[PDB]
């Protein structure tokens, strides 16, 4: 019933944790037409503009560096605070 | 029990770079502040350098801001000073104290015991012993003249310790750029010359140790 980006198990320690595979919007092969080769290199460049927008179940915006593409695992060590830090509680 | 004990120094040549380090035992460290502070020979009590609790801010004085740096490590409890280009008017006794918050100052409860540090150019050099024995009543008094030394301190014991409760030991005093002190003991003269008495000069600094057995003139 929709596109879900957290999902917390595994389809039917592991390497499919958080695998929602019905997010598939699926492939786009692009080509030149013809049996040869084209004569010219060429560039594609796709632009997406989402539209008719609903979306539900807010939550914590990530305040830590992406790792990966799958998972939310982020860097143990270097683990920031999510924003600028100053001297004293005092001081401005 | 809270305890500072802090490590390091000795005889640096002017110039020369050390770090001091103190360890913390029985408090929370991390959440507490931290300062040195050193005394001139006994007398002049001058702050140096405190950290936040954290890493957060470092403060120092007009004295030292340029080349002293202090530093914790909040894994071990451990003070840090570290103090480059190091200059005659360094010489001194440096303490970590421990800096907690009052109602609107603060204050320093606990001292550690200090590390001494003398920054100084000339050798180290072992010092000489000569007995004092006098050339008529029921007390003697006997002395050991030990001359010429240096760094401090040096130790005077007396037949190993057993004469300990009659015994002055006056401090070392600086001329020639070498120390030089005098100790007295005194004695029942039904000890002495009857018995052994020998005063035993030890001087770590050049690993030296001089006895000297104090006979009749």
């Known amino acids: 019933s929709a596109y879900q980006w957290f999902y917390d198990g595994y389809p039917t320690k592991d390497l499919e944790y958080g695998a929602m595979p019905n997010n598939m919007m699926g492939t786009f092969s692009v080509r030149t037409v013809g049996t040869s080769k084209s004569k010219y290199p060429l560039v594609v460049r796709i632009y997406m503009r989402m539209k008719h927008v609903r979306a539900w179940i807010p939550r914590p915006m990530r305040n830590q560096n992406y790792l990966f593409k799958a998972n939310p695992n982020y860097a143990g060590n270097s683990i920031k605070p999510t924003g600028a830090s100053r001297t004293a509680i005092t001081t401005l | 029990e809270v305890k500072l004990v802090e490590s390091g120094g000795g005889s640096v040549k002017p110039g020369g770079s050390l770090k001091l380090s103190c360890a913390a035992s029985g408090f929370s460290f991390s959440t507490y502040g931290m300062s040195w502070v050193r005394q001139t020979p006994e007398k002049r009590l001058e702050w140096v350098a405190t950290?936040?609790?954290?890493?957060?801010?470092?403060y120092y004085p007009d004295s030292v801001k340029g080349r002293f740096t202090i530093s914790r490590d909040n894994a071990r409890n451990i003070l840090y000073l570290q103090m480059s280009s190091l200059r005659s008017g360094d010489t001194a006794m440096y303490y970590c104290?421990?800096?907690?918050?009052?109602?609107?100052?603060?204050?320093?409860?606990?001292w550690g015991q200090g590390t001494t540090l003398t920054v100084s150019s000339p050798k180290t050099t072992p010092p000489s012993v000569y007995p004092l024995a006098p050339a008529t009543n029921s007390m003697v008094t006997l002395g050991c003249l030990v001359k010429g030394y240096f760094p401090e301190p040096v130790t005077v014991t007396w037949n190993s310790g057993s004469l300990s409760s009659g015994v002055h030991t006056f401090p070392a005093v600086l001329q020639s750029d070498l120390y030089t002190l005098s100790s007295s003991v005194t004695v029942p003269s039904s000890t002495w010359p009857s018995e052994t008495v020998t005063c035993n000069v030890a001087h770590p600094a050049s690993s030296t140790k001089v006895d000297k057995k104090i006979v009749p003139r």
């Open positions: 950290i936040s609790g954290g890493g957060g801010y470092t």
């Open positions: 104290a421990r800096r907690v918050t009052t109602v609107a100052e603060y204050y320093f409860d606990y």
